[PDB]
Structure formats: C-alpha cells, structure tokens
Amino acid sequence: TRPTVRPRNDVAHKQLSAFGEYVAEILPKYVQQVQVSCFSELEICIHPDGVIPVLTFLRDHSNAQFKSLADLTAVDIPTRQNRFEIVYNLLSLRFNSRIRVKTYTDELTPVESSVSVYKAANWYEREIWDMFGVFFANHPDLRRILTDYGFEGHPFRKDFPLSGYVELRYDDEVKRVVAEPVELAQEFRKFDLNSPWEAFPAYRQPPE
Amino acid sequence: TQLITVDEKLDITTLTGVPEEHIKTRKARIFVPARNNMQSGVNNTKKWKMEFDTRERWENPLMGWASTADPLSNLVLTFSTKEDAIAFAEKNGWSYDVEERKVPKPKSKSYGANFSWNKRTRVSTK
Amino acid sequence: GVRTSPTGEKVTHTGQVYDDEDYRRVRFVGRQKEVNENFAIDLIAEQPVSQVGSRVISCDGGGGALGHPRVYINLDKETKTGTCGYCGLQFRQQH
Amino acid sequence: SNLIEVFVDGQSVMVEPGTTVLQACEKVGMQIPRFCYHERLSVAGNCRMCLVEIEKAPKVVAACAMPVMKGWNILTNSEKTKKAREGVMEFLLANHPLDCPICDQGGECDLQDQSMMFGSDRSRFLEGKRAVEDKNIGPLVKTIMTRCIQCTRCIRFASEIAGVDDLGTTGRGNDMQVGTYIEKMFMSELSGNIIDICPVGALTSKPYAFTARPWETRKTESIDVMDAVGSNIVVSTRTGEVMRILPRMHEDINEEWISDKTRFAYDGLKRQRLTEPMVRNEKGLLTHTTWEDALSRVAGMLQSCQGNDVAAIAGGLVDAEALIALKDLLNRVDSDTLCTEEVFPTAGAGTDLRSNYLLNTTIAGVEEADVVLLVGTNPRFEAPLFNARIRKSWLHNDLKVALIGSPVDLTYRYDHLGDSPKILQDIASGSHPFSQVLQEAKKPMVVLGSSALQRNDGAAILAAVSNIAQKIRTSSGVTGDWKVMNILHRIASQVAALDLGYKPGVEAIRKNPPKMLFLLGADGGCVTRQDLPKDCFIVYQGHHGDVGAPIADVILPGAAYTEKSATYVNTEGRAQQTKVAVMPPGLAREDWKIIRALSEIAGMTLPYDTLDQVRNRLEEVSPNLVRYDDVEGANYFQQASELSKLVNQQLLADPLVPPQLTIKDFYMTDSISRASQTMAKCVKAVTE
Amino acid sequence: ALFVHRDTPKNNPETPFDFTPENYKRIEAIVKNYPEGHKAAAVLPVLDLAQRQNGWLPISAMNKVAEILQVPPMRVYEVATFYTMYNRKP
Amino acid sequence: LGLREIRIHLCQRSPGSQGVRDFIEKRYVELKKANPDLPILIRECSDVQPKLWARYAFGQEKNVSLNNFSADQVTRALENVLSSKA
Amino acid sequence: PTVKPPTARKFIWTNHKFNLSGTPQQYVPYSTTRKKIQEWVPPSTPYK
Amino acid sequence: TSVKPIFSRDMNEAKRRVRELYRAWYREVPNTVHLFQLDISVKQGRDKVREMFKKNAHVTDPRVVDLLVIKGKMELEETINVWKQRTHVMRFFHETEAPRPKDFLSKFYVGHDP
Numbered sequence A: 001t002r003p004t005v006r007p008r009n010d011v012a013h014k015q016l017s018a019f020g021e022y023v024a025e026i027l028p029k030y031v032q033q034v035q036v037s038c039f040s041e042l043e044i045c046i047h048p049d050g051v052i053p054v055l056t057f058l059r060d061h062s063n064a065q066f067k068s069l070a071d072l073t074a075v076d077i078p079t080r081q082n083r084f085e086i087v088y089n090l091l092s093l094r095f096n097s098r099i100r101v102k103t104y105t106d107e108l109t110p111v112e113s114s115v116s117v118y119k120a121a122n123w124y125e126r127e128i129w130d131m132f133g134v135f136f137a138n139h140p141d142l143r144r145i146l147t148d149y150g151f152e153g154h155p156f157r158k159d160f161p162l163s164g165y166v167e168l169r170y171d172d173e174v175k176r177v178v179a180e181p182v183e184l185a186q187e188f189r190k191f192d193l194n195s196p197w198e199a200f201p202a203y204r205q206p207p208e
Numbered sequence B: 001t002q003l004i005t006v007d008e009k010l011d012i013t014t015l016t017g018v019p020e021e022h023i024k025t026r027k028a029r030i031f032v033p034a035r036n037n038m039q040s041g042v043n044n045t046k047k048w049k050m051e052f053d054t055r056e057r058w059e060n061p062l063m064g065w066a067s068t069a070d071p072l073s074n075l076v077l078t079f080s081t082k083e084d085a086i087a088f089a090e091k092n093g094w095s096y097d098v099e100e101r102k103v104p105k106p107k108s109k110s111y112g113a114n115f116s117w118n119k120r121t122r123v124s125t126k
Numbered sequence C: 001g002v003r004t005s006p007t008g009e010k011v012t013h014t015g016q017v018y019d020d021e022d023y024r025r026v027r028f029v030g031r032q033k034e035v036n037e038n039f040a041i042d043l044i045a046e047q048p049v050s051q052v053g054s055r056v057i058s059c060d061g062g063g064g065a066l067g068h069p070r071v072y073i074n075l076d077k078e079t080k081t082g083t084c085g086y087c088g089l090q091f092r093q094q095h
Numbered sequence D: 001s002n003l004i005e006v007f008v009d010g011q012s013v014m015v016e017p018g019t020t021v022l023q024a025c026e027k028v029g030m031q032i033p034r035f036c037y038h039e040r041l042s043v044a045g046n047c048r049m050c051l052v053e054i055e056k057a058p059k060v061v062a063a064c065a066m067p068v069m070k071g072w073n074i075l076t077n078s079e080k081t082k083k084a085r086e087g088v089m090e091f092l093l094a095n096h097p098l099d100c101p102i103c104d105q106g107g108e109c110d111l112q113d114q115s116m117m118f119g120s121d122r123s124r125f126l127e128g129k130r131a132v133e134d135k136n137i138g139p140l141v142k143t144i145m146t147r148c149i150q151c152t153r154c155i156r157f158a159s160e161i162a163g164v165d166d167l168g169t170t171g172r173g174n175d176m177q178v179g180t181y182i183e184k185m186f187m188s189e190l191s192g193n194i195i196d197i198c199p200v201g202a203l204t205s206k207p208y209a210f211t212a213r214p215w216e217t218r219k220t221e222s223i224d225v226m227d228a229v230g231s232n233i234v235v236s237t238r239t240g241e242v243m244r245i246l247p248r249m250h251e252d253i254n255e256e257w258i259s260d261k262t263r264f265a266y267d268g269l270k271r272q273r274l275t276e277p278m279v280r281n282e283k284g285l286l287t288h289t290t291w292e293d294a295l296s297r298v299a300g301m302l303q304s305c306q307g308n309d310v311a312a313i314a315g316g317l318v319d320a321e322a323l324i325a326l327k328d329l330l331n332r333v334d335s336d337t338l339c340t341e342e343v344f345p346t347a348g349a350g351t352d353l354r355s356n357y358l359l360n361t362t363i364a365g366v367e368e369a370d371v372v373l374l375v376g377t378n379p380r381f382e383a384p385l386f387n388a389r390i391r392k393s394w395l396h397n398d399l400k401v402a403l404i405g406s407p408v409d410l411t412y413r414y415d416h417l418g419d420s421p422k423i424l425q426d427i428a429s430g431s432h433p434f435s436q437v438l439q440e441a442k443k444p445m446v447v448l449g450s451s452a453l454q455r456n457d458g459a460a461i462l463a464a465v466s467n468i469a470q471k472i473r474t475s476s477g478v479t480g481d482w483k484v485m486n487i488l489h490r491i492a493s494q495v496a497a498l499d500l501g502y503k504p505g506v507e508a509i510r511k512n513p514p515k516m517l518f519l520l521g522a523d524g525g526c527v528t529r530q531d532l533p534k535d536c537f538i539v540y541q542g543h544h545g546d547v548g549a550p551i552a553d554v555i556l557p558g559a560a561y562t563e564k565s566a567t568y569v570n571t572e573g574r575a576q577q578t579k580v581a582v583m584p585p586g587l588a589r590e591d592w593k594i595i596r597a598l599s600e601i602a603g604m605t606l607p608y609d610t611l612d613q614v615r616n617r618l619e620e621v622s623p624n625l626v627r628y629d630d631v632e633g634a635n636y637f638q639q640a641s642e643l644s645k646l647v648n649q650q651l652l653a654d655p656l657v658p659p660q661l662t663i664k665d666f667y668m669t670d671s672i673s674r675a676s677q678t679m680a681k682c683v684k685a686v687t688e
Numbered sequence E: 001a002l003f004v005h006r007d008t009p010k011n012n013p014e015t016p017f018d019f020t021p022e023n024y025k026r027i028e029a030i031v032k033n034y035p036e037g038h039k040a041a042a043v044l045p046v047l048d049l050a051q052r053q054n055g056w057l058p059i060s061a062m063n064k065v066a067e068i069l070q071v072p073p074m075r076v077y078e079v080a081t082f083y084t085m086y087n088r089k090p
Numbered sequence F: 001l002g003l004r005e006i007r008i009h010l011c012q013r014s015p016g017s018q019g020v021r022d023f024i025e026k027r028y029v030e031l032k033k034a035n036p037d038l039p040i041l042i043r044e045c046s047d048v049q050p051k052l053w054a055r056y057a058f059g060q061e062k063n064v065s066l067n068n069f070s071a072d073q074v075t076r077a078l079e080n081v082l083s084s085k086a
Numbered sequence G: 001p002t003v004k005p006p007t008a009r010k011f012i013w014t015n016h017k018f019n020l021s022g023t024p025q026q027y028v029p030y031s032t033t034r035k036k037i038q039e040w041v042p043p044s045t046p047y048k
Numbered sequence H: 001t002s003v004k005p006i007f008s009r010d011m012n013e014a015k016r017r018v019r020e021l022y023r024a025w026y027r028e029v030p031n032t033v034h035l036f037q038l039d040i041s042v043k044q045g046r047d048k049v050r051e052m053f054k055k056n057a058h059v060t061d062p063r064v065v066d067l068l069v070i071k072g073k074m075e076l077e078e079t080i081n082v083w084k085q086r087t088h089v090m091r092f093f094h095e096t097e098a099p100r101p102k103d104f105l106s107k108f109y110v111g112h113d114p
C-alpha cells in the first residue's frame, strides 16, 4: 500500500490518545467522549456547561497551551434532538498540535460565550448566531454579521432552502429595492447522486 | 436551580423565519424511500426522509426551463429514526403524514428446489 | 436541410417551430431566429456504408483518443447494416 | 427453536435451517454483491459475484446458493473474498461494451455501481471484445445484447413469474446468447419487468429510451389506478414532466412488479388532455372559456334541478375525494342518483356490507390457499398481479386452480370446469366432482370476477357463488378467520365508490332520466344522449377527451392520477393515496376543487376547503378510507347470504365470457390507455 | 455458425417434417425409458432420431419434438443449439 | 323531508362495539327486509368508536354515538332514526 | 495558417461573422424543444 | 423538561421583556419615520409594530419569547443606529407585492396553491 495510500502517523496517534486520556481525567465533570481519528486528530466531546472550564484549561494549562482559537463552527444535524454541534478548533503553538472541542445545543438552550477565553470568538459565535440561530449568552455584541439587515431565518440550517424565501429587485414605482417572494426562472435541479451500494464496510451501522 | 420547568409543546415556528404560507399549508411526507427497482442495492433505503408536497413547475417563456415558486421543492432531510423525523416536523409546525418502513419479507431459498422430483418448482432450463 | 413553416419561420433540426398564433414569435420580430443549417441526420446519411470482411468490426470515430470510446459492432444481420451507437457510421459484412 | 448459530465477520446470528449465506449476511445488515441472484427468482448461481470466504475453508462459496452450516464464520470483507470479487468483475467487464454514455442504464447500473464498489479501477483486457446480435422481442423492451452479462434473470422471470418459457440461452461458451432463437415477440402482461431485473443495459425501456437519466429524476411515490390491484409505483419526473413509472416494493400487493399497462401507459397522460374549460357556443361547438363562465353555467342549471333531475356517473379513474365531493353536492340538491359505470348487483345486502364486494381473503391470502375457484374472470388481464400471485402460489405451494368461464390462457395450468353458469349450481349441490375438492380443502378460495357481474343475471351469479362459499365455510373444515368469498374488481374507482354509498351501475338513470348529468371521467359510453331527454345538460369532468367529452355541454378539465394527491381503494379494501408528481396541464384543476368551487358558485357550499377536511368528511362516510395501507376485514358473510336468498334470480343460458380473452384486449381499457401511442404499438404488434 | 434463426424458404416452421410410423414406435420406446412426469428427459434422443431421419434439423423437427413431448419449443431450441451434433444446417 | 341513508360504523374487536356487533348479527336481516330500498351502510373499521350516521333529505346528517350500547339500545336508537324522518 | 493550414471540413463556416450583438443579426434565445402536452381538439361537427 | 433558561424564568418576566421592547419600538417609530424620511405616517408604523407583536401572540414558551425579544432588540438596534437603509425598514410594508387571493374561489381561479 505504498504509493497511493496516505501513510499513517502512529506516533501522533499515540500521543494524541494519551493527551485525550489526560484531558478526560483532569476534567471528568464535562468530558463525555474522547476520540482520535485515523488521520490523527483529537476530538474532545464535552457537556455544554463546561465550555468555559474546558477551553480555559486548554488555553492556560502548562501541558496544553492552546492559545490560538483557529475556528469556531456550528454544524446542524437535524436528526439529533440537540441538533447544533458547536465545534472549537484550537491550536497549540508550544506543543505544535491541534485539538477539537465539540459540544451541543438545540434551538432554545443557550451556549455560554467564550470571548472571555478567546477574543477571536467574538465574530465567530456571532456568525453562528447569524447562520444557525444558536444564542450565545453573555456576549458583548451579539447580532447578525453576514446576512442582510431585514433577514428572517438562519440560512445554514438544513431545513432552510438553498435559494431562500425572499429575493430582491429594484422597483421603479416606489424608487426602492424591494423584497418579494422568491421565484426561479430555472429551478435548482436536485440530483439524487447516492449509490445504492455500500461503499465503506468499516463504517457500517449495526441494524436494529 | 438554574433550570426552569417548561410544560409546553416544543414549537419554534416563530423563530425559523419561514413565511406562514410555507408553514401552515405544506404537508411533509415522512418515509423510508423505496428501492430503485433498476438496481439490487439497498443502501439508499436505510434512513428516513422528509420531503414536501410538490407545487407547480411551469415553463419558462424564454428558454423553456422549469420555473418554480416553491422554496421547499428541493428540501429533503435525513433522519436516523422515524421518531426524530416526527419530532422535527412537530417542532417546526409542519403537518406531516408517515409511511411505515417496508422491509422485504424473508424468503425460503433452495437451489435444490429447482430440481425437484414431484413439485412444480422445477426449472425447465438453467 | 432546413425547411420552412407557412409562417415563414425556419424549422430547426429538432423539428421546433413556433405556431402561427404563438406570441413568442415576437422575439424574432426585427431580429433573427438563429438555426444551424447543417443537419446531422442528413450529413451522416451521406457517408457510405463501409464494406468490411470481418464478422465483428470496431469503431472509435477516427483519431484514436480524439474520437469516442471503441465499440465493437456485430454484422451478422444481412438485412440491416451495423450502425455505431456513437458516431453513426454504418458497416456491412461483404459476404 | 431449531435456529443454528452462524457468524458473519465474527458477529453471532441465529438463522433458520435452509438459510443461504447471503441471507445470513443480510440479517446483520451486509449486502453481498450479486448479479444473477434475485430474491423472487429461483437461484441460478452463475455469475460468481457472491463468492465469499468461509474461514478454515480453502474455497470461496456461492453465497446465493450455499446453505449456512452451523458454526461457519462468513468473512465478507476478507482478502480472498475481495480477490474473488475483483477477478469476477474483471471477467464481467472483459467483453462488456464501452456504452455507458449511450446506455440508458448509466447512473442506475448495478454493473457500474458494484464495479465501483467491488471491482478494480482499470483493465488488463488487451484483446478484442465480442459483439452480440441484437434481438427484436417487441415494441416495449429495447434489446442490445452486447451488454448482456448472461445472468439469466430473463429466463427465470419469463419461466416462473411471467410463465412464458420462451426466452432461453442458445449457443455455448462465450458465444452463449440470451434470446428467443426465433424472431419472436415477447408480449406478456408483465413483460416490462425484465427491464427492471436486467441489472445491465441489455434490456431497457423502449419508450423511455434516451429521454432521461436517473440522477436528474424526482422520485414521487404513488399508486397505480389502471386496475383494482392498487400497485404501488414510483412516478419519476424530471422538470415538471413525467418520465417513466417504476414499481415500489409492496409484499402484499405487487411484490415488486407492475403490468405493462401500468409501466407504459404514461404517454397517454400527455396526449388528448383537457386543459381548459369548454362550453357550447351559439353554433353548438365546444369553445374555450374561463372557469367563472363554465362553473356559472353549470351552477345555473344545477340550481334549476331537484330530485331525480340531476344525476352523476363516476368513471373508472376517479378518486374518493371527488366521489364524496360530487355525492355531497348532489345531496345538497336532494339527489341520490349517483352511479358508477361498472355494474355490481344490488340485490340482497348489495353494497351495505363490505364483505360481499371485496377481495375478502387478501391478495396475499392466495399464498395461504390450497384450492382456488375462479368464476367468470380472466385474472391474467383484469388484474395481472393478482394473477401473478396465483401463479406464485401455483408454483411454490402446489395450488389447485379451477376456472368457470372461457378457457383463457392464465400462464399456468388449471382445471377448466366449463363455461356454463349451471356449474355454479352443480357445485352448490355437490353432484359436481370439484365440489368434493372444495369441501375437503383446508383453505378454499372462490373468486368471482366483477366482469361476470356485468351480465344481466349478475345477481344470480353472485348469489350462486356466495351459496358455494357459504356451503363450504359454514359446513366444512374452514377455520373461521379464513374468508372464502371474494370479488376481483378491475376498476380503481369502484370499491371506494361502493364504500361511499354510490349505486353501482347506471340502471337508476335509465329508470328515470335526468335533465342534467355529471360525468366524473365517465368514458365507458354506458349512457349516451340517445338515452337522455331532449336537451340534457351533460357536464363532463375529466382529464381526457375520449367518450364522455364530445357529447358534453360544459367540459371541466380535471387532474389525472399523477397530478393529484388522491385516495384510491384497491380490490381488497386497502385505502391508498397517490402523491402529486406533476401539476395538471393548463387550466386543469384538481377534481374536488372543481366540485367545491361549483358548490360555492351555486350557493350550496360544501363544508370543506382543504384536502384534510375532505378526508375528514371521507372518514365520516366510512372511516377506513383514511387508514392508508390498511386492509380492514369485513365480517357478516352469513347475513349477506341470508339476504341473497330472498329474491331468487335465474341464470341466463349465455356462457361466462370475460371481455379480455387475449393480449389484444389488454392494452386499451380506459381513457389513458386509449390515448397512449405505446399501447397502440402494443395492440398493433400483438395483432400482426 | 449462428445461434439465432431466420426464416428462409428452405428452413421455416412451414417446412414439411414428420416422423415415419416406425420412428413413432421408436419414440414411444425412448419415452418409456424415463419416469412418468419427466417426459422432457427424452428431448435429446428424439431430436437425434429426427436428425437421423432427416439428415439435419429444420425448425420443424424442433417444433415437432416440442409438440410430441409437450415441452416448450425454446427448450428444444436450447438443446439443439447447445450440442454440436445437431446439424442446424443441411 | 325524509331519511335517505343510514351509516353504521363499528370496530370488529372492541368491547365498545359489542352491542353494535350483536345488533348486526341478529336484527340486520329483518331490518333490511323491512327496509328494502334504504341503504344501511355497515362500515367496520379498526379502532373507531361506534357511530350511527343518518342522512336525511338535502344533505342534512344527524350523528348518534352508539358507544358501549347493548343490542337493544342500538335497536331503539335505530328505530328512533327510522321513525323520525327529520 | 499560410504555413500550417487548418484541417478542412465541409461544415466549417466559409464566411466568418464578427460579433453581431446590437444588430438585427443578433442571437435571440428560444426553446428548441417541441410542445409536451398535446391538447384535446374538440370536434368541429355538432353534437345533436 | 428541566431546561436552562435564556433570560426569563417564567412567562411573567418574559411578558415584562415583551412590554419593554414594545415601549422601545413605540418611542422609536417617530424617529424612524423622520430620519429614514419614510412615506408612511407615525400611526401607520405604530400599527405595523402592533401587527408584528400580535403576530407572535400565541407563544407560551418562555425561552421562545426570550429569543423573540432578543431578535426584536436586534431589529431595533439596526433601526436606531442607521444600519438599515430605507428599503430594509419599508420591507415590513409589502407594497410592491400583489394582494394574494384569500378565499377558496379566487385561489381556485389563479392556480393550484391551497
């Protein structure tokens, strides 16, 4: 399997597994799962009451020093009752490593804002509000950041359509750009591309 | 305490920003999709889907393209179970109806039945 | 091989022409209906049937990797020629 | 329990004895690749794509045919299983033509898909491929035999399910060719399902050919209405246009098959359509008009009617929503004269009890029966998948079938008792030899055709068949859960029209003719203007202009079955709803919308606005019309039998002749099939 | 050499073939070698008898063997194209 | 003006429909002999409560619950229906 | 093309046309497909 | 059914926040009509505010009306500070949109929508 297969990094896999054990036993109040991927990335899956303790630990601990918030992300998964998956990508410059911190909420439970831990998060979780509707409690200036000013709904939710609900045009009668319900001259043609045959037997979910 | 008691049905229709036309007049269909009989694979029949009623698709006067005014005409969701799908439809105020999952019944396969002594299940060729 | 409706409008190789009472002829008013006059069904009909001596011939449209995928055409039917599914060139077994 | 323990990749699973390796791997959620295997066909074992490793066994086994021994560990993902798969896919693709762009199976090909999933990614075949001569097997199935991988699903389908035995393999070796060997035209009633079970593009749909492509199609799950089977279908559409009709799997109805009428009559759905309202002008010709003018001219004549002055015929293709719509509308006028085209006898209980007009056993109850009596039906053409269920029970359960009627071909062998209806009186006395067979039967099953009830003595035929059913069931060793009496309908609108309380047959219109007549899709020609008074006001509400439309005063364009969500009840009492695939063309509207708008114009407004409220009304009239994919059992055969013994009707001397004797009379029965050019090619091809 | 058939004036289902009466007695003797219910097992010897009578098999010997054994004609066509002794050409 | 149709809904197995089932087993045959041209639509279903729908002239429908009745109470309610014509 | 000429084909335009946008020879789009639904034509004879 | 609140423990505090948000909008409407130089009257914009508040008058969950007050404060903050333009403020008044058919019969006349 030499030329075309990605070579596995066993050293970093073992190191990130040991550090995941370390984080799981220092913070067992909040840590739910710890998993290391096959391409050597460490995910810490936490309870959302420990956003500030887990991130402050990873920022300030002498064996962590994850001083850099790379990215902050929600993922909408509608089949879960806590459908929003808040992902924290942290970067350690001292130990040259990355860690993923993941937690959950639904549409109504707020997540505690992490601008006291990372000032990078100020626009990121504001974008998560704008795109998903995840309210972040005790945020300095939480409002929209990317959508238009009168915009209704949260576009990156998966029950939100691709073209939205309203579209704009200029109207010469009222001398004003107006919002009218969306009508496409050509509908977005949905392609059912999924193959009816299983591709990855290692990822097979067990039957009921 | 820092936990309150909400005894109400979970309804977020005011928060999703969807217009009232596409909330109260749409019918979600919750179903496991049928197997494409062009194929023997069954991997597309594993998850619950939510689609909606198909509204009008008319002809573009210029190009002949398929114009639409339905925003939810391409919206297909994917659920692990039926109950997650029903909870998502009730949470968003969508009227739904649910087809139960159709599994193929177990078959009694015998290659020896093709060459029987006294039964009609002999094959005439092979 | 373009032909013309009684309204004067040209007919494409599809067969498309607007009706006499269809309003969408007003888009060509003062302008032109652009058709292509090289009909492919007429041009491939002008190619002669290739006489070959084999029972199965192959066609890739000429040019190697510049044509179409190489397909193998049976020629057992003596009533009908064997036509390529891609390029439309047709073949006949000479015996 | 006698379950044995086997292992699929080490995971323990308890299977029945006789289970194959493929089914044992199916029980843990793993799908072994296959090309010749199909769970409704006999096992061939001749493509070797299912070759799996049993551990501690130095030879891969054919998982479709090998029974699991106790203690086997099936290695579905081992190295030599994968080497077997890649080698067999290499040999499958060695002589396979490079036709994937010009192939209609492309994108929905099993050979493509599990070449991606299980094959290698390149070729070692440096030779010249073979080319197979194409066969001409009819106007329906396009045949390009170079793409054939010789899986013999053809021959097994046509031999076992279609019951034809006229496909086979000629030749030997790599020259082995699948075909008929002669210029033969494979025209069964189920002949288009070899398109479905051909895994490759060797058998495609000739009407669907070149037009669409599977990823861009929108799969809408709907119901067949061409017959009373209630076959569950996928109407696949692309950009607001219907492209084809594929089956859905439903184990109790149509297992995964459909008839050729169901599969190929969708192009009558885009010809001859009623798109705009029409009224008669000053010259007496039909001219286009608005909905306001047409509904006002209908409502002005409706307000001038009362009692038997307004009537309504329901045609073959009408949903229960429009049925209860026009019923409620005409009952606001106090008119009960609501009729169907298909005559069902009203003597005795009539349509009061559901048990004397349903297929009371089930379609799936054919699998449980051991003796079947078929009276006056040709179930091959009246209901082809009910016949397919009878042939499957004939084949697998050694079912005894007997027919009373004309000796039609049924694709199996039956004891032909004769065609005279006096045989029904002989079986009801016991002096006939088949009566003792019915008495000794554990689960007997007597099916009366609804085309036998079209005769003038249909009430006597129904009474005789019910007499046989009650002479069996109340006396012999029939259990009691088992239903014996059955009626096979042929019309999709019929059973829901009987549940809603229509008077079956048009005798109540010939008895006292109205000065205004509604025709919900009524194209049977049962009541023409020679039967009405001088100027009857005929309102045709339909989707095709076939028979009822050229004699109508106001034409109301309605939706077809692909164009509306709409409740249809099959021949066994299972209520089912279609879904909107496309919208109706032009100004055509949904049918109960038209009737409700007519009631609002006339000032007799119906108390429903949305489809859900129509279905609340439909539940009020009979609550099993809204319980979808549910067969509700109907008791009280004894009371219907006691009511049937009151008026002694006599049998006519005419023999039982079903109207559909050969494949010629199959393809055109209703307004969509008669408008179909594909069905016209089918009829022209089977006559020559 | 072709494993499909086309109707020629020398070879069509209206080409006259019939067994001689002593060949009918030999067919009776062939069929009485097999169990009741499996008369279809006599396809190969009766078709070989048809070839030994006629010299080759037109597609009327195949249809006659299909008729007198009550088997489908495709199941005689399969046997005649499978085995190399049956001369489908004169 | 007068009665047009009677609809009777019931379950096949529920104990609330026991009186309706015992009505239809015994008294329906002489009911239909006494009412030869009246449609009496017995419509069994799976989980419904028993119900007596009576449609009069001009679309007017009265609705009578037959839940947990005996056969005698069903006979009395149905003869009240047949005697009313209201 | 004086040295290495383009390969001649019978369908290539012998007369090159420049950008005709803004002229009466400009391109006007239209649907190249035919009518999908065929309508019922009612009979031109009376019905009495 | 033990959920973490947003701002309000129950519906009385929630209605207090609804009431203060309505007070803030009612004070703001004359300034919005002035500085955006809208062609509406102050009474007309106040009727639109009352319409938007009566639109959500069915909600019985404290967290949902906490989010409604939060989004109303965000709309107010985009309107007081001139972040919206005149077009965003006039998008509440659907002026270029045709009046939709309301009853059954006119919806039947124009098309297939229920």
Ligand code: SF4
Residues within 6 Å of the ligand: D096, D097, D098, D099, D100, D101, D103, D104, D105, D106, D107, D109, D110, D111, D112, D147, D199, D200, D201, D202
């Ligand atoms: S049958 Fe499948 S593999 Fe063969 S040409 Fe068609 S799409 Fe390609």
Ligand code: SF4
Residues within 6 Å of the ligand: D147, D148, D149, D150, D151, D152, D153, D154, D155, D178, D197, D198, D199, D200, D202, D203
């Ligand atoms: S044509 Fe298709 S179904 Fe028939 S044997 Fe060949 S590959 Fe199989």
Ligand code: FES
Residues within 6 Å of the ligand: D033, D034, D035, D036, D037, D044, D045, D046, D047, D048, D049, D050, D051, D062, D063, D064, D065
């Ligand atoms: S699937 Fe077992 S060999 Fe074809």
Ligand SMILES: [K+]
Residues within 6 Å of the ligand: D105, D194, D195, D196, D197, D198, D199, D200, D201, D202, D203, D204
């Ligand atoms: K196929």
Ligand SMILES: [Zn+2]
Residues within 6 Å of the ligand: C059, C060, C061, C068, C084, C085, C086, C087, C088, C089
């Ligand atoms: Zn070619």
